[PDB]
Design a binder for this molecule. Structure first.
Ligand SMILES: *Cc1ccc(-c2ccc(C*)cc2)cc1
Lengths: 129, 19
C-alpha cells in the first residue's frame, strides 16, 4: 500500500544486488552512483571501516537540507558497502542493508520525496549527462 | 555523516551546474 516505499525498495534492492553479485530510475542510479563511488573511493573505504548506518544516514540530513545529491550518495555508499559484503562472502546482509536504506529514506524524507515527485524527480534532476 | 553530507552536496552542486 505504500507504493512509494515499494518502488524505492525495488530500485535500491536491485541496485545493491546488481552492484554486489523504474527501469529509467535504475539506469540513472547506476550511472550517477558509479561516478560517486569512483570519485570517492578512498572516503568510502574510510567510512566502511567504522544498523547505525541508519543514524549516520539521518545525521547527513540534520542541518535540515535534503537534495538528490545527498540521496544518491547515500545509496551509492550502500552499493559500495554491498560490493564489500559480496567480497567477504556476507551477501546475506545485502537485503537487510537495502531494506534499511529504504526505510530511513522513506521514513524520514517521505514529504520531501512526494514534493519532488518521487523517482520521477530523481530521473529529471540527473537527466543532463 | 559529515563525509557523506559534503560529498552529497558536491554531487548536487555539480549537477545543478550541468543543468
Ligand atoms: C571528507 C570529505 C570532505 C569533503 C569532500 C568533498 C567536498 C566537496 C567536493 C566537491 C568534493 C569532495 C569529500 C570528502
Amino acid at each position: 500500500e505504500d507504493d512509494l516505499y515499494r518502488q524505492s525498495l525495488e530500485i535500491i534492492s536491485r541496485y545493491l544486488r546488481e552492484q554486489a553479485t523504474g527501469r529509467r530510475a535504475l539506469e540513472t542510479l547506476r550511472r550517477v552512483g558509479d561516478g560517486v563511488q569512483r570519485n570517492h573511493e578512498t572516503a568510502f573505504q574510510g567510512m566502511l571501516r567504522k544498523k547505525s548506518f541508519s543514524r549516520v544516514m539521518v545525521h547527513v540530513f540534520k542541518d535540515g537540507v535534503t537534495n538528490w545529491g545527498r540521496i544518491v550518495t547515500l545509496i551509492s555508499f550502500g552499493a559500495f558497502v554491498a560490493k564489500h559484503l559480496k567480497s567477504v562472502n556476507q551477501e546475506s546482509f545485502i537485503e537487510p542493508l537495502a531494506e534499511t536504506i529504504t526505510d530511513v529514506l522513506v521514513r524520514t524524507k517521505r514529504d520531501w520525496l512526494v514534493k519532488q515527485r518521487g523517482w520521477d524527480g530523481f530521473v529529471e534532476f540527473f537527466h543532463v549527462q | 555523516a559529515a563525509x557523506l553530507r559534503r560529498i552529497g552536496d558536491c554531487v548536487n552542486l555539480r549537477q545543478k551546474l550541468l543543468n
